[PDB]
């Protein structure tokens, strides 16, 4: 289904029994690796659809969750 990043995040959280704090912990090595930081408040905003993550943060969460960037953006594509 063609959606947005906000729903894909919620999809991951429900499918993989993860909360926002889990995702942050997983992103920590990738934050250092890519030089892209992500705070709890800013991730909360992505989930609550307050702001849409840019290219950098999409890349960060994709590599962190091990999924396709296109899928994470809401495109009707394979998850990996």
């Amino acid at each position: 289904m063609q959606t947005d990043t906000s729903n894909r995040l919620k999809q991951i959280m429900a499918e993989r029994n993860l909360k926002q704090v889990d995702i942050l912990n997983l992103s920590i090595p990738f934050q250092k690796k890519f030089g892209i930081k992500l705070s709890k408040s800013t991730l909360s905003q992505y989930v609550n659809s307050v702001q849409s993550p840019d290219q950098n943060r999409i890349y960060l969460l994709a590599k962190t969750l091990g999924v396709s960037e296109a899928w994470l953006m809401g495109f009707d594509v394979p998850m990996v």
Binding site: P53, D54, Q55, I58, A70, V77
Partner: protein
């Protein structure tokens, strides 16, 4: 950084100039220039519009916008 080689190919093929692409995206050319030259990150909506404008296959998006150099 991001390798936009493939992306630059489609832009030349579909739009011609970077300026033409800018107009099609509804952006200034300086804005487009800074993004294609990896000085400014791509916004969420800009990537989606680029897919519409360049008629890219959505599954190819990781190779167009998320290819690290």
């Amino acid at each position: 950084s991001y390798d936009y080689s493939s992306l630059l190919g489609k832009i030349t093929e579909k739009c011609g100039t970077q300026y033409n692409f800018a107009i099609a995206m509804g952006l200034s050319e300086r804005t487009v220039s800074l993004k294609l030259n990896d000085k400014v990150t791509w916004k969420d909506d800009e990537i989606l519009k680029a897919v519409h404008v360049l008629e890219l296959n959505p599954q190819d998006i990781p190779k167009y916008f998320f290819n690290a150099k």
